[PDB]
Enzyme design. Structure first.
Site: not given
Length: 251
Positions: A215, A85, A43-46, A87, A117
């Site tokens: 972002g 993907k 959920k790091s908003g990249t 995490h 984020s």
């Protein structure tokens, strides 16, 4: 921690419950040399850096290895080249990747925007931030997740990217990715592909020349209180230790 199955504790790391019963299958997951593995803290908003990588590799849509869906069996049979993907911390990734196979891109972000984020992804922000500082989130300590990929950034199948550099210097970045990924371009094709990455980025941007929403770089400054931020900085210096990783916390 694992009380009522809330988390799955694996070799000192708190993982989501859905990671239970498949860490052996992931360790053993056969990696194809043409696979491209994108790793992010959750959920790091990249997303936008993800779109740029996807665009480069060809000069809800991307599956997460350890997620319930689509599952490891579907991911095994996806046609090449696979964009996959995860995490997970480096250490929990497919063992083929630890031997230098394929290509892993890690997308870091300064930890202040990343907590905002994560919190805004769809609970006080302050408890969330505290859970973050006390290494209580699924997938473990952030300080550990990032420092492990930084330590491996000189490996030949590892490219450690910082989210903020995509906004300060997209040009370097796009070519860095083109070369990492063996996407061969003449001059004109690289200029064109870069301009496509630029247009795709710029299309989220406002007068700050930064994205609106999760972002955005320096987002944290509008959310963190002064004391929250003083408490964070203190934890951050203490947990970062001798690590020489630095971020831009604003542009």
């Amino acid at each position: 921690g694992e009380f009522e199955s809330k988390y799955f504790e694996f070799h000192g790391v708190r993982l989501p419950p859905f990671c239970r019963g498949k860490m052996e299958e992931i360790a053993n997951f056969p990696v194809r040399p043409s696979d491209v593995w994108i790793v992010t803290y959750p959920k790091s908003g990249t997303s936008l850096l993800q779109e740029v990588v996807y665009l480069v590799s060809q000069g809800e849509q991307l599956p997460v290895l350890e997620y319930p869906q689509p599952g490891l069996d579907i991911i095994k049979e996806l046609t090449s080249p696979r964009l996959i993907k995860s995490h997970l911390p480096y250490r929990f990734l497919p063992s083929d990747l630890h031997n230098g196979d394929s290509k892993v891109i890690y997308m870091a972000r300064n930890p202040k925007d990343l907590v905002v984020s994560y919190y805004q992804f769809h609970g006080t922000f302050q408890e969330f931030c505290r859970r973050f500082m006390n290494d209580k989130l699924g997938y473990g300590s952030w300080f550990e997740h990032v420092q492990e990929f930084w330590e491996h950034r000189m490996d030949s199948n590892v490219l450690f990217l910082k989210y903020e550099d995509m906004h300060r210097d997209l040009v370097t970045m796009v070519e860095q990715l083109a070369r990492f990924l063996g996407v061969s371009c003449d001059k004109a094709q690289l200029e064109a592909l870069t301009e496509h990455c630029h247009q795709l980025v710029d299309q989220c941007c406002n007068a700050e020349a930064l994205p609106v929403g999760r972002g955005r770089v320096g987002l944290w400054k509008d959310i963190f209180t002064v004391s929250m931020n003083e408490k964070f900085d203190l934890v951050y210096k203490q947990k970062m230790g001798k690590c020489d990783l630095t971020f831009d916390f604003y542009l």
